[PDB]
Amino acid sequence: KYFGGFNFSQILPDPSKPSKRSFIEDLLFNKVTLADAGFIKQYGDCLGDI
Amino acid sequence: AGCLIGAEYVNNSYECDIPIGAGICASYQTQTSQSIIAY
Numbered sequence: 565k566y567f568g569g570f571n572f573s574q575i576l577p578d579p580s581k582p583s584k585r586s587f588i589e590d591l592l593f594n595k596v597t598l599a600d601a602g603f604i605k606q607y608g609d610c611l612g613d614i
Numbered sequence: 615a616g617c618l619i620g621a622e623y624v625n626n627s628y629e630c631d632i633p634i635g636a637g638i639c640a641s642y643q644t645q646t647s648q649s650i651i652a653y
């Protein structure tokens with residue numbers, strides 16, 4: 565990790581993250597209030613009363 | 615993307631032929647005897 569002294573750790577993917585993402589990518593996902601609206605199976609959530 | 619009936623799941627990975635959705639692709643291929651596999 566010596567690219568001439570350039571600090572590339574904030575954009576290279578973190579092996580500790582299970583999604584293989586970086587700090588800035590995680591911040592970009594956290595900064596958008598994304599609604600899935602049916603990306604996964606959720607008819608069981610619909611039939612359950614709330 | 616739901617549940618798929620009729621296509622056999624395999625542990626390998628090739629190029630996408632029929633895109634199921636959410637990272638699954640199916641193709642018609644020989645087992646070793648020809649069937650529809652998903653990967």
Ligand SMILES: *[C@@H]1O[C@H](CO)[C@@H](O)[C@H](O)[C@H]1NC(C)=O
Nearest residue numbers: 565566569570571572573574
């Ligand atoms: C790169 O920057 C991070 C953030 O401060 C730091 O933890 C890390 O030690 C730095 N790496 C190098 C090689 O300078």
Ligand SMILES: *[C@@H]1O[C@H](CO)[C@@H](O)[C@H](O)[C@H]1NC(C)=O
Nearest residue numbers: 604605606607608609610617
């Ligand atoms: C879908 O089914 C699996 C097992 O068949 C179960 O573990 C999971 O909780 C179910 N999810 C929903 C949203 O019903």
